[PDB]
mmCIF file of N, CA, C and O in Angstrom:
data_model
loop_
_atom_site.group_PDB
_atom_site.id
_atom_site.type_symbol
_atom_site.label_atom_id
_atom_site.label_comp_id
_atom_site.label_asym_id
_atom_site.label_seq_id
_atom_site.Cartn_x
_atom_site.Cartn_y
_atom_site.Cartn_z
ATOM 1 N N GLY A 265 47.174 -10.996 61.299
ATOM 2 C CA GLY A 265 48.109 -11.795 62.139
ATOM 3 C C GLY A 265 49.548 -11.341 61.997
ATOM 4 O O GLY A 265 50.379 -12.057 61.438
ATOM 5 N N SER A 266 49.842 -10.150 62.504
ATOM 6 C CA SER A 266 51.190 -9.602 62.431
ATOM 7 C C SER A 266 51.904 -9.731 63.775
ATOM 8 O O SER A 266 53.041 -10.197 63.840
ATOM 9 N N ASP A 267 51.228 -9.325 64.847
ATOM 10 C CA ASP A 267 51.806 -9.407 66.184
ATOM 11 C C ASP A 267 50.791 -9.938 67.196
ATOM 12 O O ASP A 267 50.604 -11.148 67.327
ATOM 13 N N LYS A 268 50.143 -9.027 67.909
ATOM 14 C CA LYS A 268 49.148 -9.391 68.913
ATOM 15 C C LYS A 268 48.092 -10.324 68.331
ATOM 16 O O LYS A 268 47.680 -11.288 68.976
ATOM 17 N N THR A 269 47.660 -10.036 67.108
ATOM 18 C CA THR A 269 46.651 -10.863 66.447
ATOM 19 C C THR A 269 46.372 -10.406 65.023
ATOM 20 O O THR A 269 45.901 -11.176 64.188
ATOM 21 N N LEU A 270 46.678 -9.158 64.764
ATOM 22 C CA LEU A 270 46.485 -8.566 63.445
ATOM 23 C C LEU A 270 46.869 -7.092 63.439
ATOM 24 O O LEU A 270 47.751 -6.680 62.686
ATOM 25 N N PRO A 271 46.229 -6.274 64.286
ATOM 26 C CA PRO A 271 46.542 -4.851 64.360
ATOM 27 C C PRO A 271 48.014 -4.643 64.690
ATOM 28 O O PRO A 271 48.580 -3.584 64.423
ATOM 29 N N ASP A 272 48.624 -5.691 65.252
ATOM 30 C CA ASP A 272 50.037 -5.688 65.617
ATOM 31 C C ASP A 272 50.536 -4.298 65.999
ATOM 32 O O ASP A 272 51.643 -3.895 65.640
ATOM 33 N N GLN A 273 49.700 -3.581 66.732
ATOM 34 C CA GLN A 273 50.018 -2.229 67.189
ATOM 35 C C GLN A 273 50.645 -1.399 66.072
ATOM 36 O O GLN A 273 51.731 -0.839 66.231
ATOM 37 N N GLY A 274 49.950 -1.324 64.944
ATOM 38 C CA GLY A 274 50.445 -0.562 63.814
ATOM 39 C C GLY A 274 49.385 0.341 63.216
ATOM 40 O O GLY A 274 49.638 1.514 62.945
ATOM 41 N N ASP A 275 48.191 -0.208 63.014
ATOM 42 C CA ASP A 275 47.084 0.554 62.447
ATOM 43 C C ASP A 275 46.138 1.034 63.544
ATOM 44 O O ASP A 275 45.461 2.052 63.390
ATOM 45 N N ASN A 276 46.095 0.296 64.648
ATOM 46 C CA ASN A 276 45.233 0.647 65.769
ATOM 47 C C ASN A 276 45.864 0.223 67.093
ATOM 48 O O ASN A 276 45.388 -0.701 67.753
ATOM 49 N N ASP A 277 46.939 0.905 67.474
ATOM 50 C CA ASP A 277 47.641 0.603 68.718
ATOM 51 C C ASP A 277 47.152 1.497 69.854
ATOM 52 O O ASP A 277 47.211 1.119 71.023
ATOM 53 N N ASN A 278 46.676 2.684 69.500
ATOM 54 C CA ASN A 278 46.182 3.642 70.481
ATOM 55 C C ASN A 278 44.916 3.150 71.179
ATOM 56 O O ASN A 278 44.578 3.620 72.265
ATOM 57 N N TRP A 279 44.212 2.211 70.553
ATOM 58 C CA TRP A 279 42.978 1.674 71.124
ATOM 59 C C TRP A 279 43.169 1.286 72.589
ATOM 60 O O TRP A 279 42.227 1.332 73.382
ATOM 61 N N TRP A 280 44.392 0.901 72.943
ATOM 62 C CA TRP A 280 44.697 0.501 74.312
ATOM 63 C C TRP A 280 46.028 1.084 74.785
ATOM 64 O O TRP A 280 46.574 0.648 75.800
ATOM 65 N N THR A 281 46.549 2.069 74.056
ATOM 66 C CA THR A 281 47.814 2.698 74.427
ATOM 67 C C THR A 281 47.929 4.106 73.845
ATOM 68 O O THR A 281 49.032 4.618 73.651
ATOM 69 N N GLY A 282 46.787 4.730 73.574
ATOM 70 C CA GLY A 282 46.788 6.074 73.022
ATOM 71 C C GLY A 282 45.652 6.919 73.563
ATOM 72 O O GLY A 282 45.796 7.586 74.588
ATOM 73 N N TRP A 283 44.517 6.889 72.872
ATOM 74 C CA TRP A 283 43.345 7.653 73.286
ATOM 75 C C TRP A 283 42.690 7.030 74.516
ATOM 76 O O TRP A 283 41.956 7.698 75.240
ATOM 77 N N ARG A 284 42.967 5.748 74.747
ATOM 78 C CA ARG A 284 42.416 5.034 75.888
ATOM 79 C C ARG A 284 43.291 5.246 77.114
ATOM 80 O O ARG A 284 42.880 4.976 78.242
ATOM 81 N N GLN A 285 44.507 5.732 76.882
ATOM 82 C CA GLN A 285 45.445 5.981 77.960
ATOM 83 C C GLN A 285 44.981 7.151 78.823
ATOM 84 O O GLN A 285 45.347 7.254 79.994
ATOM 85 N N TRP A 286 44.174 8.030 78.235
ATOM 86 C CA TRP A 286 43.664 9.193 78.949
ATOM 87 C C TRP A 286 42.408 9.743 78.277
ATOM 88 O O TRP A 286 42.368 10.904 77.868
ATOM 89 N N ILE A 287 41.380 8.906 78.172
ATOM 90 C CA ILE A 287 40.121 9.321 77.554
ATOM 91 C C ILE A 287 39.442 10.407 78.384
ATOM 92 O O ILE A 287 39.004 11.426 77.850
ATOM 93 N N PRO A 288 39.339 10.196 79.709
ATOM 94 C CA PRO A 288 38.709 11.143 80.614
ATOM 95 C C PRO A 288 39.690 12.180 81.161
ATOM 96 O O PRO A 288 39.699 13.328 80.718
ATOM 97 N N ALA A 289 40.514 11.770 82.125
ATOM 98 C CA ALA A 289 41.498 12.661 82.734
ATOM 99 C C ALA A 289 42.091 12.035 83.988
ATOM 100 O O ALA A 289 41.589 12.237 85.094
ATOM 101 N N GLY A 290 43.160 11.272 83.809
ATOM 102 C CA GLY A 290 43.806 10.624 84.935
ATOM 103 C C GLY A 290 43.484 9.147 85.018
ATOM 104 O O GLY A 290 43.135 8.638 86.082
ATOM 105 N N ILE A 291 43.601 8.459 83.888
ATOM 106 C CA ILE A 291 43.326 7.030 83.826
ATOM 107 C C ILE A 291 44.593 6.236 83.509
ATOM 108 O O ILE A 291 44.770 5.115 83.985
ATOM 109 N N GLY A 292 45.471 6.829 82.701
ATOM 110 C CA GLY A 292 46.708 6.169 82.335
ATOM 111 C C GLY A 292 47.902 7.080 82.513
ATOM 112 O O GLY A 292 48.905 6.694 83.115
ATOM 113 N N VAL A 293 47.784 8.299 82.002
ATOM 114 C CA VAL A 293 48.850 9.279 82.120
ATOM 115 C C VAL A 293 48.982 9.730 83.566
ATOM 116 O O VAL A 293 50.082 9.832 84.105
ATOM 117 N N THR A 294 47.838 9.969 84.191
ATOM 118 C CA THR A 294 47.791 10.373 85.586
ATOM 119 C C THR A 294 47.023 9.329 86.399
ATOM 120 O O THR A 294 47.105 9.298 87.625
ATOM 121 N N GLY A 295 46.280 8.466 85.702
ATOM 122 C CA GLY A 295 45.526 7.425 86.367
ATOM 123 C C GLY A 295 46.380 6.213 86.694
ATOM 124 O O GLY A 295 46.396 5.743 87.832
ATOM 125 N N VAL A 296 47.092 5.712 85.688
ATOM 126 C CA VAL A 296 47.963 4.551 85.854
ATOM 127 C C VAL A 296 49.312 4.965 86.427
ATOM 128 O O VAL A 296 49.699 4.536 87.513
ATOM 129 N N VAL A 297 50.020 5.804 85.675
ATOM 130 C CA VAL A 297 51.332 6.295 86.077
ATOM 131 C C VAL A 297 51.367 6.654 87.558
ATOM 132 O O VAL A 297 52.392 6.509 88.220
ATOM 133 N N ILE A 298 50.245 7.133 88.065
ATOM 134 C CA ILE A 298 50.148 7.526 89.460
ATOM 135 C C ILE A 298 50.045 6.312 90.379
ATOM 136 O O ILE A 298 50.611 6.300 91.472
ATOM 137 N N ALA A 299 49.325 5.293 89.927
ATOM 138 C CA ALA A 299 49.156 4.072 90.704
ATOM 139 C C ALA A 299 50.360 3.148 90.548
ATOM 140 O O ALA A 299 50.641 2.328 91.423
ATOM 141 N N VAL A 300 51.073 3.286 89.432
ATOM 142 C CA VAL A 300 52.247 2.462 89.171
ATOM 143 C C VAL A 300 53.477 3.062 89.837
ATOM 144 O O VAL A 300 54.282 2.358 90.445
ATOM 145 N N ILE A 301 53.604 4.376 89.714
ATOM 146 C CA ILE A 301 54.714 5.105 90.293
ATOM 147 C C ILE A 301 54.639 5.075 91.811
ATOM 148 O O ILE A 301 55.658 4.995 92.489
ATOM 149 N N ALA A 302 53.419 5.141 92.335
ATOM 150 C CA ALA A 302 53.199 5.124 93.775
ATOM 151 C C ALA A 302 54.131 4.128 94.459
ATOM 152 O O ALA A 302 54.603 4.365 95.570
ATOM 153 N N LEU A 303 54.402 3.021 93.774
ATOM 154 C CA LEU A 303 55.285 1.998 94.296
ATOM 155 C C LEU A 303 56.743 2.330 93.989
ATOM 156 O O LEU A 303 57.548 2.538 94.896
ATOM 157 N N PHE A 304 57.070 2.379 92.700
ATOM 158 C CA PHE A 304 58.427 2.688 92.261
ATOM 159 C C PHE A 304 58.928 3.969 92.916
ATOM 160 O O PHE A 304 60.129 4.156 93.103
ATOM 161 N N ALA A 305 57.992 4.840 93.268
ATOM 162 C CA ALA A 305 58.319 6.103 93.908
ATOM 163 C C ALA A 305 58.822 5.881 95.331
ATOM 164 O O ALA A 305 59.542 6.716 95.878
ATOM 165 N N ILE A 306 58.446 4.751 95.929
ATOM 166 C CA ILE A 306 58.871 4.433 97.285
ATOM 167 C C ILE A 306 60.224 3.748 97.280
ATOM 168 O O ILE A 306 61.047 3.958 98.171
ATOM 169 N N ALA A 307 60.448 2.938 96.262
ATOM 170 C CA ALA A 307 61.701 2.223 96.116
ATOM 171 C C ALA A 307 62.859 3.198 95.988
ATOM 172 O O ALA A 307 63.972 2.935 96.440
ATOM 173 N N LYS A 308 62.579 4.332 95.372
ATOM 174 C CA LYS A 308 63.585 5.367 95.187
ATOM 175 C C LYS A 308 63.581 6.334 96.367
ATOM 176 O O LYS A 308 64.542 7.074 96.579
ATOM 177 N N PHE A 309 62.492 6.323 97.133
ATOM 178 C CA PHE A 309 62.363 7.196 98.292
ATOM 179 C C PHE A 309 62.934 6.535 99.540
ATOM 180 O O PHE A 309 63.502 7.205 100.403
ATOM 181 N N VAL A 310 62.773 5.220 99.632
ATOM 182 C CA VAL A 310 63.270 4.473 100.780
ATOM 183 C C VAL A 310 64.631 3.850 100.491
ATOM 184 O O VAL A 310 65.368 3.493 101.411
ATOM 185 N N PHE A 311 64.964 3.725 99.210
ATOM 186 C CA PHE A 311 66.244 3.148 98.810
ATOM 187 C C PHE A 311 66.988 4.082 97.861
ATOM 188 O O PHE A 311 66.413 4.436 96.810
#
C-alpha cells in the first residue's frame, strides 16, 4: 500500500507502462500514441 495499491509503480510499473506498452508492435508506442495523437495532431493542424 504505497500508491496505486502496493506496487506503487516502483517494483512493477512496467506491467502496464513498460513491456505492456509495446508487447507486440504498435499497441502503446505506436498503438496508443497513434490513436491519441490522431486527435492532438489535428488540434495543432487545424489550430
